Amino acid sequence: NLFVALYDFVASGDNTLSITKGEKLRVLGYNHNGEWCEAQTKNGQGWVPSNYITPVNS
């Protein structure tokens, strides 16, 4: 489940994680309605918006 960041997102509390466009990440899980995604990048782990990432592989 490899994904890549579509846009920049800066963390602002609630255990969110800052990501830069083009950055690869492993998705660990989602919240109840899939709006938030728990991710791991080389910089750490935390929540990022699901609409800010896209799958890699096809």
């Binding site: 579509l6 846009y7 997102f9 969110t16 919240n31 938030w36 918006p49 609409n51």
Partner: peptide, 10 residues
């Protein structure tokens, strides 16, 4: 998970 809603794509 966050209690705040996610921002919209730019």
């Amino acid at each position: 998970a966050p209690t705040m809603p996610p921002p919209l794509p730019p």
